[PDB]
Write a protein that binds this ligand. Structure first.
Ligand SMILES: O=P(O)(O)O[C@H]1[C@H](OP(=O)(O)O)[C@H](OP(=O)(O)O)[C@H](OP(=O)(O)O)[C@@H](OP(=O)(O)O)[C@H]1OP(=O)(O)O
Lengths: 42, 336, 294, 33, 48, 48, 108, 163
């Protein structure tokens, strides 16, 4: 039913600048404290 | 010498200016013993940075090695060096990297556009002007608009395209620059469009100029409308101006309107205009206005209209016979 | 949680700005796609906001994804109503002026000015200079059926006032429809139909127009229809004589270098008004060149 | 003194020049095909 | 339910004029005469 | 006196900007049509 | 060698830094008139012509036709009209020329 | 951004409702505290990490990358909501002093505005139209409301004539 969202995702080309190696644009002063959701995820 | 500049770079100097001076010293050394490719790659190593870095230049908490990549001394040196010792595409890439690093300046927008115009890329020059125009908001975008609009009119692009540009500047011109922009929009409309369109542009101008320049803009509108059309067509401009303007401006425009109507020969209309201005004007602060109405009545009138004029004059004196107007009149009398 | 409670474009755009500062470009894109999808699935596909589309395209422009930005702008303009994609089109125009090629620049400026003039006509159907400017816009665009439809709507905008001061510009609009379908469309039969409909619509009993008479006279001269041109101007003379009409056909026959027909025309102008010293002097000089001194 | 009007080819845009040379090169390559 | 979002124009539209009575003066105030005659419509009243 | 005069004059200007009344002009005896034939006769005479 | 191998557009060699637009605007380096120098010329011309017109009327006394209606109605209309027929007048002139050639050659 | 912020404050000066006044007051109070001490915040964070690790509500784990990841078994590390011991945070004496001095500063500024407005109301420019202070205040309120309707009658009382 999400026709306009699907059409947008179809019409958009892939980004020509790679982003798979991108860290967050502002780092978090660790240590990371997260939950059992991230236990399950990792 | 190469390794001694290398460890000079590796030294953490006390200031980004010091590290800037050492990097340009290395470049100057190679340029002295001319190695232009090596000097370019040394400046590239100097200004190497991530794609989307926003390191604060004045941050005295990170290393100068980290935060000399956003130094504007290095980038000015680098772009001029590439411009002199390389090609247009390489210089263009350096300019785009400055624009991405967001240390670009309207001077740099104009320099980039001038480089493309000297290499005869007029449309690319226009594109760079557009990029600078949405990078700087308005009161600096006016400097860019000055140069861009003159260059576009000189290049003589399509009239609808030029109309779009002028509406784009007029969208959020402050009044201070709106006078200039509206004058040139009307000038372009006269030289390459239709004078009716130029007149409606001047009407919007009279609405949208500053309060300092509003009477001047109304007078400009009246003169150009009298040149391009009839005085009967300059009548409603006079009516709108004397309906909207402040007190002194309305007095002056009523006097001009009455003179124009007397010149056309409508003595009764001139009398009505003089009566309106007589309502608005206090005799002890407008002696020249009352003298002008006396001149009009002795050149066109009889003693019945003259005694009507004096009845109106002393009625206006009675109306303005207040303490506030006394303060204002005494201040003006002992200031003159 | 905030977008679940307050799903407005305002809060989605705040999230997108947050992720542009503190996240990755992939998460900015995910926030924008989730906003488009959420507002689509709740409010309907035409109720997604041009503010979302503009901000997504501007983020990609910041990322230097010019193709992605162009795709976002084009998709939003194609899938939104124009009354609520006004500002999307304005941003698209500025985008193409910044980064597009030249043909894209006049394409988007053509669409923008076409919509502006359409709004101006929708307010005032009788603004003749607006009609002339949108006429020239369509001629410079070069879409022939569009230009013909624009001129046909302009013709159908008949001035209800019978004042010749408005009929100047209206007949002049007929003159430009003729000039376009003589010089660009090269439709001679259509130009003849233009002139015939103009002659039908002019109230010749009150006022005739030497502009259109001259224009179609020279048009039929260019076509080569001597007899038709002479018949039309003779019908003009028998309908309503005019000083400019007589002077211009005298000049045309003088350039034509014939003698007998222009002699008859000089006689007709003398019959209409014997006081035209210009025509008397011109006929006398022509006879002097003819060396019929008697 | 009347200024001599040296008629430059009313300035040809370098993008148009590059398009012209690219398209004539492509026409030459099509002739080669 | 969540509070109504009001504007300064809503506040101005519901501000209430200070009543000057033509009969009563419990505190014995001295009211300026323009303020005393403001609420009279007999200045408004037109006779043809 | 200067500061009370500035506040004073701003108040008086707000008054006067409200206090203005329109201008009723008499209908001109020579209207645009007879302007058109008088300019037609004038240009005819000067071209003669 | 530095001052001849740099382009000297953004760099300032005597201060060893970037060139400032506060001191040397690029409007100095321009070969043309900016929008404000232009349009200020327009304001000056307008006030000059207005003063000239009022002193001309005052040396004169009243209405003349050439200032009651100085440019003909629809003059922009007629100007852009003949600008659009800057070509078809030449073509109909050549039509008259060839028609004259035809008639004279038929007579001869 | 600066000038749009200044323009927004100028437009938002006038009263709209108490929700806007509360939001403005909170934002101004956050600005007046200024930048938080992230060093003290991080010291408290690490002390809470080791204390909750000792108390068994935090698991220190190492993933395939060999890094310290803390896992809150409950969700009560960051917030004392859902914490059964939320009522035994005894605040620091310096914190209590800082809050008290904040409130004392607010009190002083209100008293200072009270003094200033009493002085400017005690000043009298022009004609006395009142007979006591409450009358003066009421006449000033009347002028604030009604002067836009009584200007012609006021001109008549000044000059002596006309409607
Ligand atoms: O042909 P029309 O639409 O009826 O108007 C014409 C046109 O003048 P306009 O440009 O003011 O409309 C004529 O030709 P031009 O002046 O444009 O060259 C002019 O002819 P003359 O030059 O001989 O004066 C005169 O025609 P005429 O004077 O013979 O009537 C005039 O007619 P009207 O203004 O009276 O309509």
């Amino acid at each position: 039913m999400a026709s306009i969202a699907a059409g947008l995702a179809a019409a958009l080309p892939k980004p020509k600048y790679s982003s798979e190696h991108e860290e967050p644009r502002a780092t978090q002063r660790g240590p990371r404290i997260v939950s059992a959701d991230q236990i399950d995820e990792t | 010498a190469r390794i001694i500049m290398e460890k000079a770079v590796k030294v953490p100097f006390k200031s980004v200016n010091e590290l800037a001076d050492m990097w340009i010293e290395w470049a100057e050394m190679e340029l002295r013993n001319k190695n232009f490719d090596e000097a370019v790659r040394i400046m590239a190593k100097a200004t190497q940075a991530p794609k989307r870095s926003t390191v604060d230049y004045f941050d005295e908490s990170l290393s100068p090695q980290q935060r000399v990549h956003k130094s504007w001394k290095l980038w000015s040196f680098y772009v001029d060096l590439v411009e002199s010792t390389s090609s247009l595409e390489e210089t263009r890439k350096i300019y785009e990297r400055i624009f991405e690093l967001r240390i670009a300046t309207p001077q740099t927008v104009v320099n980039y556009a001038n480089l493309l115009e000297e290499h005869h890329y007029y449309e690319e020059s226009f594109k760079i002007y557009e990029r600078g125009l949405d990078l700087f908001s308005y009161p600096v975008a006016f400097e860019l608009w000055n140069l861009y609009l003159t260059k576009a009119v000189d290049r003589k692009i399509s009239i609808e395209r030029l109309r779009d540009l002028f509406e784009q500047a007029i969208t959020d011109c402050p009044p201070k620059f709106a006078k200039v922009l509206y004058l040139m929009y009307g000038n372009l409309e006269e030289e390459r469009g239709l004078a009716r369109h130029a007149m409606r542009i001047y009407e919007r101008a009279t609405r949208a100029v500053a309060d300092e320049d509003r009477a001047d803009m109304f007078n400009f509108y009246i003169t150009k409308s009298a040149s391009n059309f009839g005085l009967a067509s300059t009548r409603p401009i006079y009516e709108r101006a004397i309906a909207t303007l402040p007190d002194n401006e309305a007095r002056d425009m009523c006097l001009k309107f009455a003179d124009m109507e007397k010149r056309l020969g409508e003595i009764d209309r001139a009398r009505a205009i003089y009566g309106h201005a007589s309502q608005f004007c206090d005799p002890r602060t407008n002696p020249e206005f009352w003298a002008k109405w006396e001149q009009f009545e002795v050149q066109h009138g009889n003693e019945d209209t003259f005694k009507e004029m004096l009845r109106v004059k002393r009625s206006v004196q009675a109306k303005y016979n207040t303490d506030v107007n006394f303060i204002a009149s005494q201040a003006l009398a002992r200031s003159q | 949680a905030y977008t679940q409670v307050h799903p407005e474009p305002r809060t989605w755009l705040k999230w997108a700005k947050f992720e542009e500062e503190f996240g990755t470009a992939d998460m900015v894109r995910d926030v924008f796609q989730s906003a488009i999808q959420y507002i689509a699935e709740t409010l309907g596909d035409d109720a997604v906001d041009e503010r979302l589309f503009i901000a997504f395209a501007r983020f990609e422009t910041r990322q230097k994804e010019y193709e992605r930005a162009r795709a976002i702008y084009k998709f939003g303009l194609d899938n939104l109503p124009r009354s609520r994609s006004m500002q999307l089109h304005a941003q698209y125009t500025t985008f193409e002026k910044q980064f597009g090629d030249k043909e894209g620049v006049e394409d988007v400026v053509l669409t923008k000015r076409r919509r502006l003039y359409e709004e101006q006509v929708k307010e005032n159907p009788k603004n003749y200079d607006v009609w002339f400017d949108f006429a020239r816009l369509e001629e410079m665009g070069g879409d022939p059926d569009r230009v013909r439809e624009v001129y046909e709507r302009a013709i159908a905008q008949v001035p209800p006032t019978q004042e010749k001061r408005h009929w100047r510009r209206y007949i002049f609009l007929f003159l430009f429809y003729a000039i376009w379908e003589e010089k660009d469309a090269k439709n001679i039969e259509r130009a003849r139909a233009i002139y015939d409909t103009c002659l039908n619509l002019i109230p010749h009993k009150k006022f005739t127009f030497a502009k259109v008479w001259i224009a179609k006279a020279h048009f039929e001269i260019r076509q080569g229809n001597l007899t038709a041109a002479r018949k039309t101007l003779g019908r003009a003379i028998g309908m309503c004589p005019k000083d400019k009409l007589f002077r211009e056909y005298i000049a045309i026959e003088q350039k034509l270098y014939e003698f007998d027909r222009c002699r008859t025309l000089y006689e007709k102008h003398a019959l209409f008004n014997p006081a035209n010293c210009q025509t008397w002097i011109r006929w006398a000089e022509l006879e002097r060149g003819l060396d019929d001194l008697d | 003194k009347q200024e001599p009007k040296t008629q430059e080819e009313l300035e040809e845009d370098a993008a148009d020049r590059d398009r012209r040379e690219r398209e004539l090169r492509e026409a030459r390559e099509l002739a080669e095909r | 339910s969540p509070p109504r979002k009001l504007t300064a124009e809503d506040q101005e539209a519901w501000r209430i004029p200070p009543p000057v009575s033509m009969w009563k003066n419990p505190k014995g105030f001295t009211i300026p005469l323009d303020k005393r005659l403001a609420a009279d419509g007999r200045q408004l009243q037109e006779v043809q | 006196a200067a500061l009370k005069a500035g506040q004073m004059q701003k108040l008086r200007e707000a008054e006067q900007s409200s206090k203005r009344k329109p201008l009723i002009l008499p209908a001109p005896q020579v209207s645009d049509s007879e302007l058109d034939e008088i300019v037609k006769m004038g240009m005819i005479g000067e071209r003669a | 060698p530095v001052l001849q191998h740099l382009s000297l557009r953004n760099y300032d060699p005597v201060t060893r830094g970037p060139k400032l637009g506060f001191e040397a605007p690029p409007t100095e380096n321009l070969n043309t008139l900016t929008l404000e120098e232009k349009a200020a010329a327009l304001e000056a011309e307008a006030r000059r012509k207005a003063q000239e017109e009022q002193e001309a009327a005052a040396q004169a006394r009243g209405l003349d036709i050439t200032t009651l209606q100085p440019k003909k109605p629809n003059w922009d209309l007629k100007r852009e009209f003949k600008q659009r027929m800057a070509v078809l007048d030449v073509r109909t002139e050549n039509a008259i020329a060839r028609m004259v050639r035809e008639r004279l050659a038929e007579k001869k | 951004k600066r000038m749009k912020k200044k323009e927004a404050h100028r437009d938002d000066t006038a009263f709209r409702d108490y929700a806007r006044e509360a939001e403005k007051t909170y934002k101004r109070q956050i600005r007046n505290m200024g930048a938080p001490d992230l060093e003290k915040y991080m010291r408290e964070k690490l002390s809470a990490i080791e204390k909750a690790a000792a108390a068994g509500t935090l698991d220190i784990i190492e993933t395939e990358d060999g890094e310290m990841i803390a896992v809150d078994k409950d969700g009560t590390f960051f917030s004392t909501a859902n914490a059964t011991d939320f009522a035994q945070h005894k605040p620091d004496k310096a914190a209590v002093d800082r809050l008290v001095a904040d409130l004392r500063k607010a009190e002083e500024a209100s008293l200072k505005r009270r003094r200033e407005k009493l002085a400017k109301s005690g000043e009298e420019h022009g004609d006395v139209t009142y007979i006591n202070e409450k009358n003066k205040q009421f006449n000033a309120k009347l002028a604030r409301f009604y002067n836009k309707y009584t200007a012609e009658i006021r001109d008549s009382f000044e000059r002596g004539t006309m409607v």
